[model samples]
Target: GMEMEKEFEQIDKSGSWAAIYQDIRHEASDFPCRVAKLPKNKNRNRYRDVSPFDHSRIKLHQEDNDYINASLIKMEEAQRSYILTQGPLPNTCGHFWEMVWEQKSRGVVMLNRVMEKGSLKCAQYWPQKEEKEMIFEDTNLKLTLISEDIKSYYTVRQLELENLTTQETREILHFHYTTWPDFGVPESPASFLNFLFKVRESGSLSPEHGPVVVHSSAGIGRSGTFCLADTCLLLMDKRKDPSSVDIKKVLLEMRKFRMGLIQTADQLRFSYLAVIEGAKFIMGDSSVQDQWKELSHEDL
Candidate 1:
């Protein structure tokens, strides 16, 4: 904890956040996204430039074409894996669910809203209360919204996904951090950690389960922040030493599975603060969470 605090203070003093980010951007060698650039798959990408790496991209088995703007990031040392993906394009909602079903993911962590500042960021892929259910004709899958628990800054929903062809069903949890501003970090580390713990409490990120699907528009900035903080804290817990986890190195490793793990310097700094704050809770300070819950104003 002291080492991390010292590093954070030094970075803040030197205002070298951008330098660190640029270092990661330059040091993490690039890979190909050729599959994502294929003619047939072009329309499936939400952003032309934010394509998944060809090697780590998730594949769908239902159709001949398996391209999706999603990557499977595995942190073996932390025993963690996450499917970082773009917000589903209007035409690729079915493919999104298909990946979920095929991957057997038990939960989804959505860090962006369907709309941000009067612009569409993500498609309304899941059914809402009024809609109740949605059927994906393209993939022959059905998703029914069983229940929703709305909070001050996030929402937790229970969904049942069924394969129409086989009639097999699975329950999936949707964890949405709703108040995260577009192009900005969450209101506070307390609020972000509160939401992170909510997802953690469900054990959806366990190695025993399939990788948790995490997305935020292009699926790099906020999604990267979320995963980095989570993975770092997990490492801190395992090693019993928060300083042992090199935040930059871990982010670099994650970028190997995806093109860009984090986009902005502020988001990078926020990840550090989150991991530092989260380590307090993991290091036997049980009451820290209650303080986090209150500080975050979660009930509002």
Candidate 2:
């Protein structure tokens, strides 16, 4: 971390947040959406807006066919590997579980919700308590709701996954941020950081637990933003000097692993916003009330 700080401290301080966002837009505009244009990748996407980069797509270890809208991103610097995916298509829910099981993933981080428009946007990926369990007969797996907690902008589901054959079971954590917009970031970085801490509390995002699965409608936008904010905030937490962590470098590194992370200029701007807001706490600000006050001001 120190070496990286020294390496890019000047680069980070050289540019304004707006300048960084502008560069991102310019770069993303020039890159061809080659992955989506691929013949073999045509059917692998859930939404036309969401597609994985072929070079970085996650493949199934079990079968010759595991083509869901998902990508496994390995981040060596963070020691974090995230499977950024879309909410499953009905037929692909089995493939999704097959992924979670095969990857030994400890939890799922979801950025969209089951609502008016979102209801049809792969909402069936998670089954509610009143609806019994999410069954994947093809994989002989069942996801039962053990518990649920709801908030204004987010929800949490405790789930149990049982393998029908061996009856082996493992618990799952489902973190959902409902109020996060379709193609944008969270309303409040404070709200999102709160959600982040809650998820990390379970050790779900830790290396010891395995990769944490993340997804949304288009997948890359919100899921991508989630991953960036989480990764940046984590770096902030690990070191006392939060301002030294360079978010632009982190985002660019992730882009190498996955096609389009932080999908929009707005999303990119929000990533910097969230990291800046959350970094205050990480820097050990003693005035907690003032910390939230500044964050709330930014939210508006």
Candidate 3:
């Protein structure tokens, strides 16, 4: 009747490692990094519309001149490239360009960005790497995290649309992280988790790749929520239970691994709800079917 949905309904049981690695590496090369560029005149309006959720926007007004200075410090300390799907920060594109440059300077290979919703016309303007080859000289093994400030989370359908639009050529993860009181939609948490599951599934099919990068503002709130939920789900999958022993203890322990793990009380509560909701959804509870359905719609 409905084409007997086959993809998500089954865990990717193929266990095809060679094919998976080849797929991910090729997809990883084209990772989306930037937001769709709006018409020059529409940029300000779009910013105004999304400003409420941007911590930097509000902080700029409160601290005035010092705000830009402080944000630079934050960016400098950032462990990975923080990509934005909206637009460049207030002052200039220099900050963003510098970050990319810094990544290359450090000998990190494969640093790239993807833009959402931008006209294919602007594709010509996309950043290009220098001609020099990216030599990997360092022997020290260190973990790297990619960050993003997404304008919105995708539903399963939306994510599918993204996959189709990009020709199923990229690796994607989605999850609902708790957003702050002033920011984030109510459904964001669940939506984010779904995304994460997709990423995990993709990863399980291919393990040589690292985790996908996620971010909002400050790289803590929304980012932390998704990361925490992901870690929990992974643990649950291993334990195969909703009520695993010392769950809270498990969360707290995970927190130490990522400082300011939840970042806000609302986020913590959202994670709790997401856990309950996620379990029910995965278990095929009909009552919460609408939640998943909502994510697939365009009005979101």
Candidate 4:
């Protein structure tokens, strides 16, 4: 953390981090999220401030209403693709499944809990252990919890998403990270990377699949951090020079597909920390992982 420590101090002193944040906010191209703001589709969005750009928004096959608060972020250089979305609303849970089915995503990454700080952050879209099954008649999709593995801060659930119309089924992995604070970063970058690598090991995020669906309450704060860190690390490995990757440039590239990524300056800072920490592992420090496991207590 020597060089990183000095860099943080400089940015912290000169407020360069805030300058980068403001530049990203102002420099990113503007696109009309017309569909997201349409009177008929307003309820489909979880938050008014957060909406997916029309150019990259995922449209459902339904002819009546194809709106969904989600975007397909394609970073071809890093070979990374993600369907970043706001947490599904109660009325839009059916639409959520329809998008997932249409997109053929093998995994769903949730960065916020259903309830946080005594407020409802997200809808209970998936079936729990007791319920066993949940059906969305609007899309004619059925979800059954095949299994669950709960840890201290995250939970991994295997779900069978069934298309009732065709009777076809697909296994979907649900990686729910439950402890991230609302509008805040995770407990540690080590813990965050531990959870990210768990999803990676499942092979769900590969380009072979449509795109791993990632969501937080608003889908831009914690969600952006997750994707940004992952993409930066991937680019670092691809280039074989972790130092060459520009975090701000990569974030600007990603914001083209979705609006307002990396919400807070702190989240932006955490993304940088995570990428640096992840780079060590990518650079071949097997022992560092053991330390990460212990530091994160990921298993417990």
Maximum-lDDT candidate:
1
lDDT (Cα, tens digit) per residue for candidate 3, span 8-79: 122134534335324323332121211222243233222332221223221222221211111111121112
| Candidate 2 weakest ten by summed lDDT | 1-10
In candidate 1, what residue range of length 10 has the lowest lDDT sum?
127-136
Better of 2 and 3 by lDDT: 2
Query: What C-alpha lDDT values do all the predictions have?
Result: 0.92, 0.73, 0.34, 0.90
How well does candidate 4 match the true structure in TM-score terms?
Answer: 0.95
| Candidate 2 off by > 4 Å | 1-19, 25-41, 116-119, 286-300
Top model by TM-score, which number? Answer: 1
Measured against the true structure, the TM-scores of the candidates, in listed sequence, are 0.98, 0.82, 0.40, 0.95
User: Which model, 1 or 4, shows the larger lDDT?
Assistant: 1
Between candidates 2 and 4, the TM-score winner? 4
lDDT of 1 by residue, 1-300 (tens): 368788999999999999988988889868988889889887999887788888889999955898889999989899889999999988999999999999989999999999999999999999997376899999999999998999989999999999999999999999999988756899999999999999999989877789999999999989999999999999999988877988988999899999877888999999999999998988889999999999999787
From the highest TM-score down, the ranking of the candidates is 1, 4, 2, 3
Off by over 4 Å in 4: 1-9, 13-15
For model 1, the superposed segments whose C-alpha errors exceed 4 Å read none
**Comparing candidate 3 with candidate 4, which one achieves the higher TM-score?**
4
Residue-pair clashes per candidate, as listed?
0, 0, 13, 0
Q: Write the per-residue lDDT of candidate 2 for residues 1-300, one digit (tens) a residue.
A: 343444344445765545666676556423334656667757656667656666777676655565666777787766778998887776778878888988899999988765535367765776687468877888889988888887666788999988887889999899987788776667776767777777877889878876899988767778888888888877667656676577777887777666667766667767766677666666676475355545544233
